[PDB]
Design a protein around this ligand. Structure first.
Ligand SMILES: [Zn+2]
Ligand SMILES: [Zn+2]
Ligand SMILES: [Zn+2]
Lengths: 82, 427, 359, 135
């Protein structure tokens, strides 16, 4: 017979990905690399989209030179969050 | 041949009515009744346009131009529109017919059409729907219909994130049903307490702060632990950072057993009060991780103006209680009602340098838009502008988008939408 | 209303039995009730559910019917919908088929003469799902025809729901042509607010149709959208969508590792997905021997589906062509048997591949 | 609960060197990647120097040699770093450059290492001298 007993509880959570990102899928190097082209010849930053797809700036730029879609989801790519 | 005089007289009447109804000064009247009057006058003008002129195109465009002339004067109108929409949708008892509701929504949509800057409009939607998190008290399907009709003419991103709001709520209730089914299938004693977990998303829902770490009582802690263990199973790759700002709970107290309604922090305060009497404020604050700024609202809500229920009072009766006000537990049966609730605190708790950063952002955007001039078709300019900056989250491509959208007002960057090929090239 | 809540909670506080004493208290509450208050509705719900534990079916049907006549305009439609769903879940866990359909058609007629556009549609679609669960086709034709007549745009959600229902119907009996027609009809719609499970089925059907037809570009987009929608909703239809996405990415001249996408990274060590993981580790970074070993080591999982089987001949061919192209770059004149040795195939097939590549 | 940047960085570096003790490259690479994510806000330069050292070490241990040699050569010029471990880093850079795959990058780094006068004092100089002229 506890003094107060809990009967209901409407908890609120906030799910987030355990790994935000570990690889730029144009160069197979992690996002904090120089995107291989900058590694050989030496600035280099990451870029994001609406689909939350982090890539190297130079990799996504050279992809967008001839293409206009995100490499992973194959939909229209536009810049968001630098 | 002689309708010019009537047109001029009605335009002057519209001008005087608009300058009377803008009321940038002399405020003080009730905002909700003011907005109701705005709705009434707009509907009166709509009725005049329809019934007498027989929806003539000339009169329609002239009244549209009139509305654009006298409508831009006010600034904090979208907040008023969102307030009116929330008020109408909250209480559907008066006018449950969907036709009147959808005509009101059509009026709101056409009024929003003549206006721009929907970002503040939707952040106000976020503010009103944050403080949907409580009991629904809505129609749901009407919200779905209005958001669908808005998305038909608005597009993506914001419409998709509101669709994410609805999808998140629905998937949360289905996951709750699945967890209840799992509890029924595999009986757990600690599952005797009812759990109504309503997990949300982080990429779409608004964020308040990092939230405190208020201690959980043993039994709710174990219940949330078993829920966490279940949720880490099934689909993996995510964790649950339980918050404490929002929440609804009930508690059985004292003598007839009365059911009280508390909101998270009050529950933990009472649980700490339970195991031992004669508890002072510093003792409570020492081991509950109670907040600092938002603590003010709850501290002056548990006393100092309570209703006739009078569930709990403090012996240091004063307007301010700094450090050493000793609290005491008392029966205080008073009211005979068995569902005494302290929800009234929600009806009164809502009341009551970026300069250099914004200057730097504006200057950076302006120098980027004039200086770059590089060969772009539609997106490589967005790449090179963020390339030029050394630090990120400073670009914020949304500002580039709005700059290039508003940059079409004259010759420069006024290129053909149908073929977005020539963009002054490298000049 | 003061004594209303007190009496309702006094009747509730029994909580150990129901010897008609709580029922009489609820009847008195209804007698003192005013004009269609939610307290009366919840009292009726409580007494109905507590008397489910005490059988007495005829009174169940009678007071359920009176509750449905009460819900015409007494409380916000969300509360009534939630109560209906909860009572249906409560009565479905104990089977009780006969009273189940009795309740179903009583609800159908009650919503027919009550509000129809927003409440009868959802109940009718729930009945359609329940009747699909029983695969008692033929009469479902009548059900879908009456639903189609009722809905028939500014009704995107309803049209998407009925499209999903009829797509499930027509894929139940292998009606590929009608499935393609329905997929096109749903594609004509450009504005809707789908359920997290409804869109997934139609996206899967469209991806399957694209894969079977011959185009291997839109199939990946459709399957990826289906998997993204399936990640939040459901679980049975998760692994197969990932497998089909992997196959689609296989057939379209490779391009970006599908498992490198963050939305599907954790689904790598699942035994049902380890075959696909090894297949993508072999196809990328071209390797004939690893691909052959992975194919041979798992005949059970790979060479048993009616869709992977038809597309392993298109596969095992692009990899060899890529190997030939990579090896032929530095040389200028070579022996055919030298190609035969590394390509691991006879000389005649080497000549066939070479003539196809040259042509 | 978040403690501080310094504590997380030092624990990451400790676990990374412990991994390198028992040649575990993948976990060390993952932890150095999270350190890469969290290092842009760090304030202590000694932690940055140790981070560069362990980054070069993990890059060398991952069988990738050209970039490891470049990182070692860059680290060999640090003023705060004492001369003894500067010479150690230069020796590691020479060992990494010699043991690599022939290419333009190898020749460029070879010439750069030959230009430095400190490498003359290094023990394994004859191999460098023979490598420079393409013997
Ligand atoms: Zn990259
Ligand atoms: Zn780069
Ligand atoms: Zn994408």
């Amino acid at each position: 017979k506890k003094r107060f007993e809990v009967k209901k509880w409407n908890a609120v959570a906030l799910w987030a990905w355990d790994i935000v990102v570990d690889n730029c899928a144009i160069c197979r190097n992690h996002i904090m690399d120089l995107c291989i082209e900058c590694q050989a010849n030496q600035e280099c930053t990451v870029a994001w989209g609406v689909c939350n797809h982090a890539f190297h700036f130079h990799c996504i730029s050279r992809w967008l030179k001839t293409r206009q879609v995100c490499p992973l989801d194959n939909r229209e790519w536009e810049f968001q969050k630098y | 041949n002689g309708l010019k005089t009537m047109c001029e007289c009605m335009s002057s009447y519209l001008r005087e009515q608009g300058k009377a109804l803008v009321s940038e000064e002399g405020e003080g009247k009730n905002p909700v009744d003011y907005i109701q009057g705005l709705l009434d006058l707009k509907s009166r003008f709509d009725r005049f346009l329809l019934e007498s002129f027989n929806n003539d195109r000339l009169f329609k465009q002239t009244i549209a131009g009139d509305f654009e002339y006298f409508l831009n004067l006010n600034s904090r109108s979208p907040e008023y529109l969102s307030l009116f929409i929330d008020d109408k949708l909250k209480k559907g008892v008066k006018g449950l017919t969907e036709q009147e509701v959808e005509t009101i929504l059509d009026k709101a949509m056409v009024l929003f059409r003549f206006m721009q800057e929907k970002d503040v409009f939707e952040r106000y939607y976020k503010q009103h729907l944050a403080r949907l998190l409580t009991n629904k008290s809505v129609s749901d399907d009407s919200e779905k219909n209005m958001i669908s009709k808005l998305k038909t003419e608005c597009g993506c991103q914001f419409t998709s994130k509101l669709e994410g709001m609805f999808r998140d709520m629905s998937i949360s209730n289905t996951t709750m049903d699945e967890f209840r089914q799992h509890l029924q299938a595999t009986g757990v004693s600690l599952g005797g307490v009812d759990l109504t977990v309503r997990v949300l998303t982080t990429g779409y829902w608004p964020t308040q702060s990092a939230t405190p770490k208020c201690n959980i009582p043993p039994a709710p802690r174990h219940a949330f632990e078993i829920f966490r263990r279940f949720y880490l199973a099934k689909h993996s790759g995510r964790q649950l950072t339980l918050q404490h700002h929002m929440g609804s709970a009930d508690l059985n107290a004292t003598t007839r057993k009365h059911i009280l309604q508390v909101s998270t922090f009050q529950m933990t305060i009472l649980m700490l009060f339970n195991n031992r009497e004669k508890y002072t404020f510093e003792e409570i604050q020492q081991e509950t991780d109670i907040p600092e700024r938002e603590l003010v609202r709850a501290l002056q809500s548990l006393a100092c103006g309570k209703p006739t229920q009078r569930v709990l009072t403090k012996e240091p009766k004063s307007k301010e209680i700094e450090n050493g006000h000793i609290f005491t537990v008392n029966d205080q049966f008073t009211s005979k009602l068995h569902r005494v609730k302290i929800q009234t605190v929600a009806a009164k708790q809502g009341e009551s340098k970026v300069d250099d950063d914004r200057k730097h952002e504006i200057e950076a955007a302006i120098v980027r838009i004039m200086k770059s001039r590089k060969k772009m078709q539609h997106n490589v300019l967005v790449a090179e502008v963020t390339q030029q900056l050394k630090a990120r989250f400073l670009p914020s491509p949304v500002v580039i988008k709005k700059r290039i959208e508003g940059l079409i007002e004259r010759e420069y960057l006024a290129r053909t939408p149908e073929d977005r090929k020539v963009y002054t090239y490298v000049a | 209303n003061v004594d209303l809540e007190n009496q309702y909670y006094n009747s509730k506080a029994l909580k150990e039995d129901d010897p008609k004493a709580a029922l009489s208290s609820f009847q008195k509450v209804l007698e003192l009730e005013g004009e269609k208050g939610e307290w009366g509705f919840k009292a009726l719900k409580q007494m109905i559910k507590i008397n489910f534990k005490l059988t007495n079916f005829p009174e169940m049907m009678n007071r359920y019917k009176q509750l449905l006549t009460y819900i015409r305009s007494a409380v916000t439609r969300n509360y009534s919908e939630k109560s209906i769903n909860s009572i249906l879940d409560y009565i479905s866990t104990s089977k009780q088929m006969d009273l189940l359909q009795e309740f179903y058609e009583t609800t159908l007629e009650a919503l027919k003469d009550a509000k129809n556009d927003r409440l009868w549609f959802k109940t009718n679609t729930k009945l359609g799902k329940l009747y699909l669960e029983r695969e008692e086709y033929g009469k479902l034709q009548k059900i879908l025809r009456q639903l189609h007549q009722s809905c028939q745009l500014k009704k995107g959600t309803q049209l998407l729901e009925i499209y999903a229902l009829e797509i499930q119907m027509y894929t139940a009996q292998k009606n590929n042509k009608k499935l393609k027609a329905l997929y096109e009809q749903s594609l004509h719609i450009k504005s809707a607010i789908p359920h997290p499970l409804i869109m997934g089925v139609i996206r899967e059907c469209g991806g399957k149709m694209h894969l079977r037809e011959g185009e291997f570009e839109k199939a990946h987009t459709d399957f990826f959208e289906a998997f993204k929608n399936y990640d939040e909703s459901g679980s049975p239809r998760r692994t197969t969508c990932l497998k089909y996405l992997v196959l689609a990415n296989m057939l379209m001249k490779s391009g970006i590792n599908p498992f490198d996408s963050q939305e599907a990274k954790p689904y790598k060590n699942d035994p049902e997905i380890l075959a696909m993981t090894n297949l993508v580790s072999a196809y990328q970074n071209n390797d004939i021997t690893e691909f052959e070993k992975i194919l041979k080591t798992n005949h059970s999982n790979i060479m048993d589906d009616p869709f992977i089987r038809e597309h392993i001949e298109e596969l095992l061919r692009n990899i060899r062509t890529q190997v030939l192209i990579k090896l032929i770059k530095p040389y200028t004149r070579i022996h055919i048997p030298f190609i035969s040795k590394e390509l691991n195939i006879d000389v005649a097939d080497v000549e066939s591949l070479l003539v196809q590549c040259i042509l | 609960k978040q403690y501080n940047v310094d504590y997380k960085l030092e624990t990451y570096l400790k676990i990374a060197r412990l991994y390198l003790e028992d040649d575990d490259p993948v976990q060390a690479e993952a932890y150095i990647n999270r350190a890469s994510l969290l290092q842009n806000e760090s304030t202590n330069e000694q932690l940055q120097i140790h981070y560069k050292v362990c980054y070069a070490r993990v890059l060398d241990y991952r069988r990738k040699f050209i970039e490891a040699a470049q990182r070692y050569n860059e680290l060999s010029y640090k003023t705060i770093v004492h001369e003894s471990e500067r010479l150690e880093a230069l020796k590691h850079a020479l060992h990494c450059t010699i043991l690599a795959s022939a290419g333009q990058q190898r020749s460029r780094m070879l010439a750069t290492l030959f230009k430095d006068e400190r490498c003359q004092q290094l023990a394994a100089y004859g191999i460098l001298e023979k490598m420079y002229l393409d013997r």
